[PDB]
């Protein structure tokens, strides 16, 4: 069938076979507008105001850039990863040289609107400003392929971020 016996929601694994489930292309389509806002608990978080498909390598290159522009001892970046992953070039004639093994391996997320990505969470009484915050994320936002805006602590008040 289709999703069950998940591997902790990263990707679904076939019930009668440990193979990955190999879903449809437009499964889990991000082209909703997510109704549920995110209750971020970091001081600032980077939510995705639009939708798209973002790799893990695009999200890891962004962390390596956010982790440069951030004061070390004070704030510890927090990157969320519980979201579900999705496959790539999977099909057989649709792969190159019958190497379906080396094309599906990439795992990209289908982010809807308003999913938090990172967190400049605090480890002290040190504080942040939106100017002090957007300045950090302005490095990584140039890698995350979709549009994203930073949001302050607590419930994103999506009346304003949009």
């Amino acid at each position: 069938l289709r999703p069950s016996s998940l591997l902790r929601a990263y990707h679904y694994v076939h019930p009668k076979t440990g193979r990955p489930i190999r879903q449809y292309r437009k499964y889990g389509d991000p082209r909703f507008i997510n109704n549920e806002v995110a209750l971020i608990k970091g001081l600032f978080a980077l939510i995705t105001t639009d939708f798209g498909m973002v790799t893990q390598s695009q999200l890891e290159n962004a962390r390596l850039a956010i982790l440069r522009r951030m004061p070390r001892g004070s704030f510890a970046l927090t990157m969320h990863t519980d979201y579900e992953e999705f496959p790539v070039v999977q099909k057989s004639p649709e792969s190159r040289m019958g190497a379906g093994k080396s094309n599906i391996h990439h795992f990209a997320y289908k982010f809807t609107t308003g999913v938090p990505l990172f967190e400049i969470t605090a480890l002290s009484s040190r504080r942040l400003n939106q100017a002090e915050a957007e300045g950090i994320f302005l490095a990584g936002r140039s890698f995350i392929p979709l549009q994203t805006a930073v949001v302050p602590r607590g419930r994103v008040d999506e009346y304003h971020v949009f």
């Binding site: 082209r31 507008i33 109704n35 549920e36 419930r155 999506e158 009346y159 949009f162």
Partner: protein, 195 residues
């Protein structure tokens, strides 16, 4: 009761105060889905309506983080858990819903040729979700305050749910005074499109 035929939803007295649509709040009786409710009676957020709980129940305060707050359900609270439910039923209905359209769009700018009216959102609220409101509360975005909605694809616009202060309703909904109704304008030829 049978393993085949199970109640699709069951009655529930909430002890805690869950945010989600299936959620409730302190002490109201709600028929929430079975699978969800069954991981509440284990979780402790809910308890099946025994005759005892129908008078009082020890609800929860995040202040001391334990089931101390006794919320007695006299006929007065049962006039409070109604207006507070009837309110956040309009909330969780428009916020969960994704109201569709079919419109005509000759031209290139992907522009709906007869753009939308705040009449034409309360009309697709009452049509699809039966949510009956005043179209004087629907505030549009800044891009569509001038020309109406006017563009295909996903538009959203804010619906103002005014009367939520004597219900003591905050932190159990995303925004006390608004809600994002989420349009979508699926262009269609004269066959299925109106206006």
């Amino acid at each position: 009761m049978a393993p085949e035929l199970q109640l699709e939803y069951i009655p529930i007295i909430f002890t805690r105060t869950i945010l989600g649509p299936q959620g409730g709040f302190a002490g109201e009786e709600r028929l929430i889905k079975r699978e969800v409710a069954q991981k509440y009676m284990s979780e402790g957020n809910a308890v099946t309506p025994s005759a005892e709980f129908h008078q009082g129940v020890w609800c929860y305060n995040p202040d001391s983080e334990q089931y101390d707050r006794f919320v007695e359900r006299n006929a007065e609270f049962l006039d409070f858990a109604a207006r507070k439910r009837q309110w956040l039923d309009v909330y969780w209905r428009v916020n969960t819903g994704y109201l569709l359209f079919g419109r005509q769009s000759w031209g290139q700018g992907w522009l709906l040729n007869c753009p939308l009216r705040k009449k034409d959102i309360a009309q697709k609220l009452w049509e699809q979700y039966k949510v009956r409101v005043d179209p004087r509360l629907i505030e549009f975005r800044e891009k569509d305050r001038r020309t109406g909605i006017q563009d295909l694809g996903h538009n959203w616009c804010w619906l103002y749910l005014p009367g939520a202060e004597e219900l003591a309703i905050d932190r159990e909904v995303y925004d006390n005074k608004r809600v994002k109704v989420r349009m979508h304008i699926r262009k269609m030829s004269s066959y299925g499109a109106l206006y």
